[PDB]
Amino acid sequence: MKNKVQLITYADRLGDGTIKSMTDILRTRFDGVYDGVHILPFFTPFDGADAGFDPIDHTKVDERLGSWDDVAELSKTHNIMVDAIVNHMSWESKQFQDVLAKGEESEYYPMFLTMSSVFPNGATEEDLAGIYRPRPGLPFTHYKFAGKTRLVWVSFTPQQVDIDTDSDKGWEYLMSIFDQMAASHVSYIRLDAVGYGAKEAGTSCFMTPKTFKLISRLREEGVKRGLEILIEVHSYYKKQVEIASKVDRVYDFALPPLLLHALSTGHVEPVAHWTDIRPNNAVTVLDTHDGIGVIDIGSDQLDRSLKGLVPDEDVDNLVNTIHANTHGESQAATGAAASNLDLYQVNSTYYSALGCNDQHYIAARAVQFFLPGVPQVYYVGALAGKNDMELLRKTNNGRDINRHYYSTAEIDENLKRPVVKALNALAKFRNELDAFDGTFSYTTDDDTSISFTWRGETSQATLTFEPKRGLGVDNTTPVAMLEWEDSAGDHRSDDLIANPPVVA
Amino acid sequence: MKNKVQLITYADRLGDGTIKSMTDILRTRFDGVYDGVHILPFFTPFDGADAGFDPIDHTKVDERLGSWDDVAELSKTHNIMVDAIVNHMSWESKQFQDVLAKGEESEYYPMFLTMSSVFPNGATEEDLAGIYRPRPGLPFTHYKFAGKTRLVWVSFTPQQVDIDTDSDKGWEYLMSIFDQMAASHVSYIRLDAVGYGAKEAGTSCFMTPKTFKLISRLREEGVKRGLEILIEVHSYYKKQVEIASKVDRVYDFALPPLLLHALSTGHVEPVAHWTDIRPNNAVTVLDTHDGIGVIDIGSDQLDRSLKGLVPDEDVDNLVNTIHANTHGESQAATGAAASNLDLYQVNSTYYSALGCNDQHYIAARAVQFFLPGVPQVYYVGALAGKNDMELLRKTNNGRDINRHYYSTAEIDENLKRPVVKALNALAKFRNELDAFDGTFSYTTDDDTSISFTWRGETSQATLTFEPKRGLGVDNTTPVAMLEWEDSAGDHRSDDLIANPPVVA
Numbered sequence A, B: 001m002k003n004k005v006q007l008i009t010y011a012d013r014l015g016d017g018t019i020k021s022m023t024d025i026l027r028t029r030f031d032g033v034y035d036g037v038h039i040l041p042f043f044t045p046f047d048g049a050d051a052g053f054d055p056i057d058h059t060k061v062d063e064r065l066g067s068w069d070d071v072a073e074l075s076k077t078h079n080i081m082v083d084a085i086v087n088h089m090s091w092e093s094k095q096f097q098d099v100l101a102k103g104e105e106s107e108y109y110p111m112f113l114t115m116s117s118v119f120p121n122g123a124t125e126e127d128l129a130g131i132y133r134p135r136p137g138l139p140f141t142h143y144k145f146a147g148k149t150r151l152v153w154v155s156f157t158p159q160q161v162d163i164d165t166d167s168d169k170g171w172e173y174l175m176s177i178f179d180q181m182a183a184s185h186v187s188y189i190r191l192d193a194v195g196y197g198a199k200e201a202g203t204s205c206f207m208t209p210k211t212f213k214l215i216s217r218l219r220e221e222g223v224k225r226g227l228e229i230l231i232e233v234h235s236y237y238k239k240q241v242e243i244a245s246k247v248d249r250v251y252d253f254a255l256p257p258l259l260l261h262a263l264s265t266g267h268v269e270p271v272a273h274w275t276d277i278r279p280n281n282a283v284t285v286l287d288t289h290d291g292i293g294v295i296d297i298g299s300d301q302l303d304r305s306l307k308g309l310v311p312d313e314d315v316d317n318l319v320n321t322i323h324a325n326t327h328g329e330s331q332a333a334t335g336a337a338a339s340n341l342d343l344y345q346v347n348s349t350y351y352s353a354l355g356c357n358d359q360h361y362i363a364a365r366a367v368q369f370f371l372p373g374v375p376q377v378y379y380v381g382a383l384a385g386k387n388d389m390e391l392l393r394k395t396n397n398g399r400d401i402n403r404h405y406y407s408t409a410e411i412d413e414n415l416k417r418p419v420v421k422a423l424n425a426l427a428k429f430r431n432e433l434d435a436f437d438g439t440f441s442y443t444t445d446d447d448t449s450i451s452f453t454w455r456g457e458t459s460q461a462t463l464t465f466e467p468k469r470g471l472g473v474d475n476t477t478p479v480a481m482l483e484w485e486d487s488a489g490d491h492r493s494d495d496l497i498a499n500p501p502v503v504a
Ligand SMILES: OC[C@H]1O[C@@H](O)[C@H](O)[C@@H](O)[C@@H]1O
Pocket: A050, A053, A156, A192, A193, A232, A289, A290
C-alpha cells in the first residue's frame, strides 16, 4: 500500500451524486492531498437497509452512481480501495429470494446460515449468550423457507443475511467479487465484517481459529489477483494486535478515542503505551463511516477481567465528555444501553466530539499522520464537519449524524475555512516529505509531552504533542508543534492552522 | 362491570398533566358521558421504555402524577380500571437490579425468566422459532448476573424483563399489585399481555394450556379481593372466543377493523357473522392506546390455513385504505417505518383512519355501543382527534401518532365541534336508556343492512347501519339511523350529528 494519505467517501455524498462527480472533486480540489481513495459500497443498491453494506448484487455498480468504467477511469490517477462484503448480503438478493421460495430444494440453500447450520443438535443458553455481538439482541431473525419459519443468522440488520463462507456457493460468490474488483483496476480490498465470517459452535463466532483459516484463504485469493487485503476488527485491543501479524494491514481503532481522552484530560501516557505495543502495519484513522469506537479501548465484552488501554472509569468519562461537547447531539444518535461500558460505538463526527476545537482537531490529525501506518481521512473529517442533526431526524439512523451529503457548493464553502486548509496542507506535507518512509522513534517524559520523530533519506520531522498546554472546548492555544529539515534547511511551525507546513 | 361508557386515558395527556386534573376534566367536561375510567399506567415511571408498561415500582404512583389518595378521590364518582402488568417489569426495578448484582445468590433470581429456566437442556431452532412473536426477532437480550452474561426473556422492549408467574417471588409480586389496587378503591383489573404470561418448552408460549391456568388462577385472586378481571389478548379470533368463557371480560378487538371494512366497502355481512359468534361478555372499543389490530380478524400467523373473519385480501385492502385515507401518515408510523413492538398493528387514530368523516365515525361508535358489552372510548377518539405527526417525528414511536397531549384549552376547543358533541350525547344516551340493560336482538338484510335492537323495562332502541348509502371519505350522508321509545313516546334520529339523541 502506497504510504500516502487516502480519502474515505461515499460516491454520492461528496459532489453532485455520482462516481464521476466524486472523482472530479478528488482531482480538482484535493490534488496532492488525497492520493488514494476508499469508495464506500457503491453496488446495487447503495441506499438499502445499511447504506451499501446490504448488496442485492455486489458485482453490479448501482446504475444511479455510474459504471465500472468510472472506477477504471479513476484508477488512472488514484489507487482505489473497495469493500468485499464477505459476511453477508441483502435478503432481497436473487440467491436468498430463491431460498425463501424453494427452501431445501434451492441450490442456494447451503449458501445461508441458520441456527441449525451451526447448532444441528440444538444450543444451550451458554452457546448463544457467548456469541460476540456488534448489535443488540441475538443474531437471528424469522424468514419463511418454502412456508416454513426458519431462524436465519443475521450479524447486523435483519435484512443482512449471513452467508456460509465455507459452502461451495458462498465461496463462488466471494470469488466473483474478487474477480470483479481485479478486473476493474481496484488496488486494495477491505474485508468487511470478516471477523464474523466463520461460525464455530461453542465459541464467540468472532476472531476464532476458524476465522483465521477464512482470513488466510481470502488473503491468498487476493494476492493471486494482485489485490492487497485490509481487515477491520472492532474488538478488545489484544485481538487487533493478534491478527495484525497474520495480515497485510489492520485498522488502528484504538488511536481515535485515546486522542479524545488525551485532548480532554491532558494525559499522553495511554497514547505512549499504545505507540509501544500497537501493530505498525496499520491504516490510521480518526473518523470512519461508522461511530467512534469505545469497545476498541475498553474491557472485553465477554470477559470483564481483561482490562483496556484506559481504566473503565476513563472510558465512561470519555463517552460523557463527547455527550457534553456535542451538547447532547451524540446522545440522541447513540442508542442507550445498561452502561457506557456496554457501548460498541458513539455516534458523532470527530470534529464535534472535540467541541469543534480547531487546534485539538489539527493536532489529532498530526498525531494520526505521525504514527506508523497509511493514513485515511473520512470525508466529513476532511471538511471538518459538524454533527448533522437534520439528516439524523430524517432517517432515524444514528450513524447518519456523521454522514452529511456534501454538494460541490458546500465543499467549496468549507475549503475556505482555516482548519480545512490546514488539514489539506498537513496531508500534502505527509505525502511529500520522505521522512515518513524512513525510521520511526518516540520520546516521552511522564505525562505532559510526547515527541514523534521520522528520519528519512533527504529529510527529518518531529511532532511534539502537549494537550496540557490548552485544555477546554473554547481553547485557542496550539497543542501540536512541528519541526522539520528538508532541502531548504531547518523549519518550524508552532501553529498548524496559522502557519501550515509546506515542503520546499 | 357497570354497563356504562368508560374513558381510556393517560393521566397526563388529558388536562394539565396530573391525576387531579384528569379527574377534574372527567367531572366538569364529561359528566354523564363517561361514568367509568381506565387510567393507563400511572406508576413509577410513566415515561420510561414503554409509556408506563415498564414499572420500577408498580405499587407506587409516579410522584409527578399524584398519589393513591387521588385515585381514592376519583372512585367516589367513577368506577376505576387499572392495569396489572403481570408479564414483566422494568430492568431498573429493585428486584432485577438485585439479580444483576448478586446473580444466583439473589432472593429474586427465580422471579425472572431466562432461556435456561424454560429450556434447561438447551433448545432447538424449532423450539425458538415456534415462540409466538408480534414482530420478527427472538424474545431475548443480554444482562450480566454477577458478571455472567445471561439471556433474559423479554417479550416486549429489552428493558421489560419477563417474570416467572409460577415462582413464589413472582406470585408474591403479582399479589402485592392486586392488594394495592383493592385498597385504593379500584374496581376493575386489566391483565396486560397475560397471553404471554406462561412459558413452556415446545409450545408457542402464547395462549397455551399453561396460560389458561395462569388466567384462571389470577381470576380467582381477583374475585377474592373484590376486583373484576379483563384480559387483553391480541390473537387469531378463535383464541379470543375460546378464552372468553373462562373470564369476566375480554376485549372485542375484531370490531374496530370490521367497521373500517364495512364503512369503506359497504359490506355488513362480516359484522353480522361476528355478531352471531362473538363473546358477549366483552369490553367494546374502536381505538385503544395501541395501534388498530388487523391480525385480530385475519388468518392465524402460526398456521395460515385457518382463515379469519374476512379473507386475507380484504385485510390487505383494509390496511391500504387506512394508508390512503390518512394521505400516508399511517404508512409513516406503521411497522417497519417507525419504532413499534407490533409489526402488523396499523398506527393511526380511528378518526383519521376513516379520512376524518364525521358520519362514518359517529356510525362506528353507534354500532360499538349497540353490540353487547361495556363500551370504552379512548381519549383521542373522545375528542375525535387527528394523527399527531408532530409528536411522531419527535419520538419516532409509531403509537405516538395516536397519543396526542391534550391541554385543557385544546379539550374545550374540541368540545365545540359537532362530531364531539354528537359522541358526548350518544354516550349519554347509552348510559341513560335502560334498553341496554335488557334483551338484545338483530336482523339483517343480505350484506346491505343490519339493525341492532335492545328492549328494556321502560324503553326500546334500534340502530340501523347501512354503510352502502354513504361511501367515500367526503360523504355527508348518514349511515347510522336510530329509533327509540321511552317515557315521552317514539323518537327518531336520522342523523346522529345534526340531531343527537337525548333521553327524556
Ligand atoms: O456490513 C455491516 C457493518 O460492517 C462494518 O464492518 C461496516 O464498517 C459497517 O458500516 C456496516 O454497517
